From Swiss-Prot, chain D:
Name by which UniProt lists this protein: V-type proton ATPase subunit B, brain isoform
Domain of life, source organism: Eukaryota
Protein purpose: Non-catalytic subunit of the V1 complex of vacuolar(H+)-ATPase (V-ATPase), a multisubunit enzyme composed of a peripheral complex (V1) that hydrolyzes ATP and a membrane integral complex (V0) that translocates protons. V-ATPase is responsible for acidifying and maintaining the pH of intracellular compartments and in some cell types, is targeted to the plasma membrane, where it is responsible for acidifying the extracellular environment.
Tissue expr: Expressed in brain (at protein level).
Gene label: Atp6v1b2
Span covered, complete protein: 257 to 506 of 511
Oligomer and partners: V-ATPase is a heteromultimeric enzyme made up of two complexes: the ATP-hydrolytic V1 complex and the proton translocation V0 complex. The V1 complex consists of three catalytic AB heterodimers that form a heterohexamer, three peripheral stalks each consisting of EG heterodimers, one central rotor including subunits D and F, and the regulatory subunits C and H. The proton translocation complex V0 consists of the proton transport subunit a, a ring of proteolipid subunits c9c'', rotary subunit d, subunits e and f, and the accessory subunits ATP6AP1/Ac45 and ATP6AP2/PRR.
Location in the cell: Apical cell membrane; Melanosome; Cytoplasm; Cytoplasmic vesicle, Secretory vesicle, Synaptic vesicle membrane
Binding site for ATP: R144
Family to which this protein belongs: Belongs to the ATPase alpha/beta chains family.
From Swiss-Prot, chain F:
Protein family per UniProt: Belongs to the V-ATPase F subunit family.
Organism phylogeny: Eukaryota, Metazoa, Chordata, Craniata, Vertebrata
UniProt keyword annotation of Nucleotide-binding present: no
Name used for this protein in its record: V-type proton ATPase subunit F
Keywords: Cytoplasmic vesicle, Hydrogen ion transport, Ion transport, Membrane, Synapse, Transport
Length: 204, 99, 47, 250, 170, 110, 204
């Protein structure tokens, strides 16, 4: 009733269900889809599934943790920028908001009526996340690796050198599980990994 | 950009070309060269004072703007929220008494 | 005028508690902004 | 350990019985068999959710927020089955785990429990989303008996001092982290940068522990010093100069 | 015989004498100023860099490990973050074992000193750091490197710092 | 493009800063300075002051404190943050802080 | 709950009781034992003790009135200290703040574990306060009496030429009803009155 998770059916359900997918009116109001709030949702099953992921997708658990951290650090930075503006943020924080925008708009957003996006296999899913967080670690590394240096890397310097990489990263959602084989999608995403690393070498 | 606010300031820039190089060539030039240094040094201190003044003026407005927002939060927004919360608690307890 | 007039509900209690934390946080952030500028301003006055 | 399970689909009166059943065993182990006991109750909110049903089964009118009026006494008759007793070595501690509905400390289940029990430990969604585990928030948490739990002979001489100092540094660290977000890194003082470095290392080494790392009190205090030694000796103002001279050296 | 110091040290008076007999003539006979210490200042690599960044002089690193061994390096330049190996050929590694022993530059490579946010290091030759320290100044490492042909200098290849100092000449 | 300083003052004060290298003519022939002859009407100074603070190229103005006290109305009326205005001493005239507009705007100053 | 006096039992209790000794966590965190917040606290029995005090302690009602005023003035002056710093206050304000601090730290505060403060008799209490307020009135006299003079008295001159009286005033707490006779305590307090009067006469 009224969208309020204090409701007795919600409260009783949340005491029993191991997974909750809290769809949020704010995300719906912005027409973000599928509108799942990644701060109030939860899944207890990670404790078990870490064994399956460590057998079949060894990179995934680190990536999942780094995703959650970026997504939570976005909320802190957002609430301060909403009063102080962007000028107080360090370059790491500008990068954290940049990759959080990529995660929230190009990884976590998904359209239910687009043929290439209607469903996403896990091979595509882990690849997209792996590249966005690899970009985060490398872009953040470029700033931190130039602390106290004669020239310091910045979000603007990154945006200038890496613009093609940002377009390619946001474009990863367009790879089609029907017309593209999973090995092809993975090979294309591996080319984006090499493209990122070579483009980061032009900064460093 | 300290504390999220742009403070303008000035840099003293020297372009080398003395447009008065030959002045007093016939007489007085030894003392005119000292005089050039004196006022050049004064211009540096004045560019500092001008920078301090631009900062002073910008800060005196920005501090007033900030304190006005803080006081509006402290004496408008928080009071509306607090009275609204107390009213909600009251009307929830009215529904609870009816039930 | 005196109140926000969100309609009395557990929803409104949740939202108003979050608004109070938001407003107290915003007060403290803007107070920190003011103090940082005030310190710089007092340094500028002496300078 | 003794383990009592009441499942979600076990019939609701068995959920009322289970706490009393467990405490009856704890009273036997402690007060007749001299054992020390820690009683852990996993979700007192699911127990409050049972008192609702049994009270409705008696046709009693629902009290405050639809819980039984006597819910204070009933939780007391659960919680106060605890303490040491005259002439027995035995002792019952309790740690009631308690799901605050809607995250609200004003809700009757946490509210009444806060009235009956000498502390609280808050688990925090802010820390859990950061993947800090265990995500205990050390600011709003308080053990009201701490100063009688710990000290010389009982643990280590420094412990009561270190806990006050760690709280102060974590609190000032959080204050500085909020300041950094406002002023930018270059506006921080050297002292602020110390509190911020302590904050970072404290969440990533003191709070963070993982599910199987059984740190003794001694390992916890050594981690406390491994962080507090980041500061200049004179910044540690809650600790006595004697305690610093005896433990700040490596 | 030994120089004067502004304060107490990890070093003994006999250590100061043995150092003064082996230091460069640019710094011999100068009184010593503490640049940084884990005793007198906050224990971290960031604090070390922050204190040292005001300097523009040669400096002496000193370490006592948890095995009580005294060792370190003489450096021609202050410890700082660096994009590259920096410092010059008068730089050397040393230990007391039990007497003073010194390892001057081999001439083989530029690998004198490097500084990072994550660590401070000296020497090179693949993974052979002649000295290495973590961001806490807690863990450290030392192995024989082609820059100095050095011994292990600490009691073990991997060690924990009991305490660290840096000194400058003034 | 950068900015220029402008000057209002007596013959010596202007001469001094000109040899400090300050002096320039804009492409429209207009100077960045005004020598105040005793014969100059205060309204001409005020117009020049308004022209300097309203101009795009002038980033600073210097004014002799005695003249600053004569033009005081327009001087204290100017509060735009961009063109900074400094009240300066001169050989027969008051000291650097005498009745200064910034000191009178300030609260925390001694 | 949370210190909120609108709570029905608390609100009705404050409605009925004639005295509220408002203990405060802030004062306890500062170790200001007994940690009673004198701004929040009150007693409605003041009138009812006039008869008692007029007989036994005829000066004490003036002293109590002055004490509360001095402490209240320091709380108002602290806003000015935050706005413009201690240096900006008038001499009368500065001496008021210094004396209010002396009253706060050496009269309101009391270490009940020490032999001298484990208990504190009423005659002791009156004599301590009498000295602090007699000092206040004479210090304030010298300041105000040297308004418009060539040389004006200030708290710093009082601390320079008679800071021994400030030290003695702070020391008056150590007097012991067991080891010292009541007459001996009263005589030492009377000696401090004579000492301060002669010290003030050296200035004004």
């Amino acid at each position: 009733p009224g969208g309020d998770f204090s409701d007795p059916v919600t409260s009783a359900t949340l005491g029993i269900v191991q997974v909750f997918w809290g769809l949020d009116k704010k995300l719906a109001q912005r027409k973000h889809f599928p509108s799942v709030n990644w701060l109030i949702s939860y899944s207890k099953y990670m404790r078990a599934l870490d064994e399956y992921y460590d057998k079949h997708f060894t990179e995934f658990v680190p990536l999942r943790t780094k995703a959650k951290e970026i997504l939570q650090e976005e909320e802190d930075l957002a609430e301060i920028v909403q009063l102080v503006g962007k000028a107080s943020l360090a370059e790491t924080d500008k990068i954290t908001l940049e990759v959080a925008k990529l995660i929230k708009d190009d990884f976590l957003q998904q359209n239910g009526y687009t043929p290439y996006d209607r469903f996403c296999p896990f091979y595509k899913t882990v690849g997209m996340l792996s590249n966005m967080i690899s970009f985060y670690d490398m872009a953040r590394r470029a700033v931190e690796t130039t602390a106290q240096s004669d020239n310091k890397i910045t979000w603007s310097i990154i945006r200038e050198h890496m613009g093609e990489i940002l377009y390619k990263l946001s474009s990863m959602k367009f790879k089609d599980p029907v017309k593209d084989g999973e090995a092809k999608i993975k090979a294309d995403y591996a080319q984006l990994l090499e493209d990122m690393q070579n483009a980061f070498r032009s900064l460093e | 950009n300290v504390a999220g606010v742009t403070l303008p300031v000035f840099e003293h820039y020297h372009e080398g070309t003395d447009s008065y190089e030959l002045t007093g060539l016939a007489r007085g030039g030894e003392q005119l060269a000292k005089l050039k240094r004196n006022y050049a040094k004064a211009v540096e201190l004045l560019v500092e004072l001008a920078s301090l003044q631009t900062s002073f003026v910008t800060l005196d407005e920005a501090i007033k703007i900030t304190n006005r927002r803080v006081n509006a939060i402290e004496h408008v927004i928080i009071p509306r929220i607090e009275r609204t919360l107390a009213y909600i608690i009251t009307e929830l307890d009215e529904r609870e008494r009816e039930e | 005028k005196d109140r926000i007039e969100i309609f009395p509900s557990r929803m409104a209690q949740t939202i108003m508690k979050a608004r109070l934390k938001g407003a107290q946080t915003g007060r403290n952030l803007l107070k920190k902004k003011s103090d940082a500028l005030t310190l710089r301003f007092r340094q500028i006055l002496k300078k | 350990v003794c383990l009592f399970l009441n499942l979600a689909n076990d019939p609701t009166i068995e959920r009322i019985i289970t706490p009393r059943l467990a405490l009856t065993t704890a009273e036997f182990l402690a007060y007749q068999c001299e054992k020390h006991v820690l009683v852990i109750l996993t979700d007192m909110s699911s127990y409050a959710e049972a008192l609702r049903e049994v009270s409705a089964a008696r046709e009693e009118v629902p009290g405050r927020r639809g819980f039984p009026g006597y819910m204070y006494t009933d939780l007391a008759t659960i919680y106060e089955r605890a303490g040491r007793v005259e002439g027995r070595n035995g002792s019952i501690t309790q740690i009631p785990i308690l799901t605050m509905p809607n995250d609200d400390i004003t809700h009757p289940i946490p509210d009444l429990t806060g009235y009956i029990t000498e502390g609280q430990i808050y688990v925090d969604r802010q820390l859990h989303n950061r993947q800090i585990y265990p995500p205990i928030n050390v600011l709003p948490s308080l053990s009201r008996l701490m100063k009688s739990a710990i000290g010389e002979g009982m643990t280590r001489k420094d412990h009561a001092d270190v806990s006050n100092q760690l709280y102060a540094c974590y609190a000032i660290g959080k204050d500085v982290q909020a300041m950094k977000a406002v002023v930018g890194e270059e506006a921080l003082t050297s002292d602020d940068l110390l509190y911020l470095e302590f904050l970072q290392k404290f969440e990533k080494n003191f709070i963070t522990q993982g599910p199987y790392e059984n740190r003794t009190v001694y390992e916890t205090l050594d981690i406390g010093w491994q962080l507090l030694r980041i500061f200049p000796k004179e910044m540690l103002k809650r600790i006595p100069q004697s305690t610093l001279s005896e433990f700040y050296p490596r | 015989l030994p120089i004067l110091q502004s304060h107490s040290a990890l070093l003994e008076n006999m250590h100061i004498e043995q150092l003064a007999r082996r230091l460069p003539a640019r710094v011999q006979g100068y009184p010593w100023r503490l640049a940084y210490s884990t005793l007198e200042h906050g224990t971290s690599l960031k604090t070390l860099y922050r204190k040292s960044a005001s300097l523009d002089s040669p400096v002496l690193l000193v370490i006592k490990d948890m095995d009580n061994q005294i060792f370190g390096a003489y450096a021609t330049h202050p410890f700082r973050f660096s994009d590259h190996y920096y410092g010059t050929g008068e730089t050397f590694l040393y230990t007391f074992s039990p007497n003073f022993k010194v390892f001057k530059w081999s001439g083989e490579n530029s690998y004198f000193i490097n500084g990072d946010i994550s660590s401070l290091e000296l020497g090179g030759g693949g993974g052979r750091f002649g000295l290495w320290l973590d961001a806490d100044l807690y863990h450290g490492r030392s192995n024989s490197c082609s820059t100095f042909n050095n011994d292990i200098l600490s009691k073990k290849e991997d060690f924990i710092v009991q305490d660290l100092e840096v000194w400058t000449f003034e | 493009r950068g900015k220029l300083i402008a000057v209002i003052g007596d013959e010596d004060t202007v001469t001094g800063f000109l040899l400090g290298g300050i002096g320039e003519l804009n492409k429209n022939r207009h100077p960045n300075f005004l020598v105040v002859e005793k014969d100059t009407t205060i309204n001409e100074i005020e117009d020049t002051f308004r022209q300097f603070l309203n101009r795009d190229d002038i980033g600073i103005i210097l004014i002799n404190q005695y003249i600053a006290e004569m033009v005081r109305h327009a001087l204290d009326a100017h509060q735009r943050s961009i063109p900074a205005v400094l009240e300066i001493p001169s050989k027969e005239h008051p000291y650097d802080a005498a009745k200064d507009s910034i000191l009178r705007r300030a609260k925390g100053m001694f």
